[PDB]
């Protein structure tokens, strides 16, 4: 019930029940039809929250494993919990990335959409890269990288540097460099080029794009400072 | 593995995985032995959050369903408020089932008995929040019955200053104002708890309580 499922998701969005919210949009996606800009948001929001909950628990629990170096019984316990959250994390990611391969990207009849979903794909392969270890990690990093890259060229091609989507993928791509394969110079020139070029053209912001673009632009300069 | 469980409870806590944290402390509790002060609180923290997320979602949908008196939409909001409600009761029930089989029975200390009576009054109050129809009547009764019993023990056993004594006062008066709708009463139970502990003058745990007591009183007043 495309209509009743999307309603149920907006409901579960307000109730802050995001597993419910994501279960509604999965179904809407698995129906095969291209998501409206509104459905694409809901799914994006549902899984960002669904996955974000595990990233948070992982980071906390991992920083604890690092903190209990030299405390065996404790580190052991931290680690087994980390590993337990990671599996949840991956499954979430594997679900999302699959919807993305089987439904979202395939049916993206638009440039913006192609760019949005491939960014998202680079995102979730990043979340997997964050918790992947040695062996499997190399190909995960590359799967994110390669998704970000195609998304980058299409954004450079199709969009003004002030486009909320273009900026959010530049921000995210620079983060991937900085934190994923830790290429600090690259992350910096990417993030700094994206900042400069849209900063040079504020006057291209619509009434629909000012807060989104200027938000991410504020997220870019912040990362530039941190780095 | 009991300290094992308690540890993972502190872990799932720092991680904000209260489904985890709660499944640990339920197993702990289910082993049979009286709970320490640390275990009892982890239990309360775990489920307060498990229940809390439902109560929170419940409220959101509730007004959505009410601010919608639009049919098929209110119907969808109705059935949703309901699924959450069901989830909310199963939670309250699991706790109230723990409170009957293990917790209150083992309660050797007065503070113990009162901490578990308060809690038992808390969780019948969460049920009452969503108890509609013929249902609500007995539900509030059970809540009030445990708060009151808890209240009298504490009155004649603990000090006005005791964090556990204060916290029951705090919640019993929240029952009055919100469940019974007795603001005047809720305010006398609260004011008296403050005044009597203010005379007698566990800081950390019992100063936040007067904080919540006084915070509530200024609102209502």
């Amino acid at each position: 019930d495309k209509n009743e499922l999307v309603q149920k998701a907006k409901l579960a969005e307000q109730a802050e029940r995001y597993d419910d919210m994501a279960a509604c949009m999965k179904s809407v996606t698995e129906q095969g039809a291209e998501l409206s800009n509104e459905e694409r948001n809901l799914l994006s929001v549902a899984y960002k929250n669904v996955v974000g909950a595990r990233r948070s628990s992982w980071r906390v629990v991992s920083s604890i494993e690092q903190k209990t170096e030299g405390a065996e019984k404790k580190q052991q316990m931290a680690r087994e919990y980390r590993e337990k959250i990671e599996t949840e994390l991956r499954d979430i990611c594997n679900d999302v990335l699959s919807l993305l391969e089987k439904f979202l990207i395939p049916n993206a009849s638009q440039a913006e959409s192609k760019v949005f979903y491939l960014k998202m794909k680079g995102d979730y392969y990043r979340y997997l890269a964050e918790v992947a270890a040695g062996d499997d990690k190399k190909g995960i990093v590359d799967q994110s990288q390669q998704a970000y890259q195609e998304a980058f060229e299409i954004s450079k091609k199709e969009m003004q540097p002030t486009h909320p989507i273009r900026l959010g993928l530049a921000l995210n791509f620079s983060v991937f460099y900085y934190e994923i394969l830790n290429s600090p110079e690259k992350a910096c020139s990417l993030a700094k080029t994206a900042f400069d070029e849209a900063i040079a053209e504020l006057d291209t912001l619509s009434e629909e794009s000012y807060k989104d673009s200027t938000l991410i632009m504020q997220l870019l300069r912040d990362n530039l400072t941190l780095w | 593995d009991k300290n094992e469980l308690v540890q993972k409870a502190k872990l799932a806590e720092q991680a904000e995985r209260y489904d985890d944290m709660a499944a640990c402390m339920k197993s702990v509790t289910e082993q049979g032995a009286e709970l320490s002060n640390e275990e009892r609180n982890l239990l309360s923290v775990a489920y307060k959050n498990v229940v809390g997320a439902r109560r929170s979602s419940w409220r959101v949908v509730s007004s959505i369903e009410q601010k919608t008196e639009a049919e098929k939409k209110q119907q969808m909001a109705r059935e949703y408020r309901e699924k959450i409600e069901t989830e909310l009761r199963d939670i309250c029930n699991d706790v109230l089932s723990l409170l009957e089989k293990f917790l209150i029975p083992n309660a050797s200390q007065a503070e113990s008995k009162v901490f578990y009576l308060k809690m038992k009054g808390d969780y019948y109050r969460y049920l009452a929040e969503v108890a509609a129809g013929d249902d609500k009547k007995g539900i509030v009764d059970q809540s009030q019955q445990a708060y009151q019993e808890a209240f009298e023990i504490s009155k004649k056993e603990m000090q006005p200053t005791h964090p556990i004594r204060l916290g029951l006062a705090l919640n019993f008066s929240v029952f009055y104002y919100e469940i019974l709708n007795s603001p005047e009463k809720a305010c006398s139970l609260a004011k008296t708890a403050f005044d009597e502990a203010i005379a007698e003058l566990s800081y950390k745990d019992s100063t936040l309580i007067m904080q919540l007591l006084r915070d509530n009183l200024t609102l209502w007043t």
Partner: peptide, 13 residues
């Protein structure tokens, strides 16, 4: 309603 007892990424909506 009564009281009782470091690198940033895109906004995502």
């Amino acid at each position: 309603r009564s009281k009782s007892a470091k690198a940033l990424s895109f906004d995502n909506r």
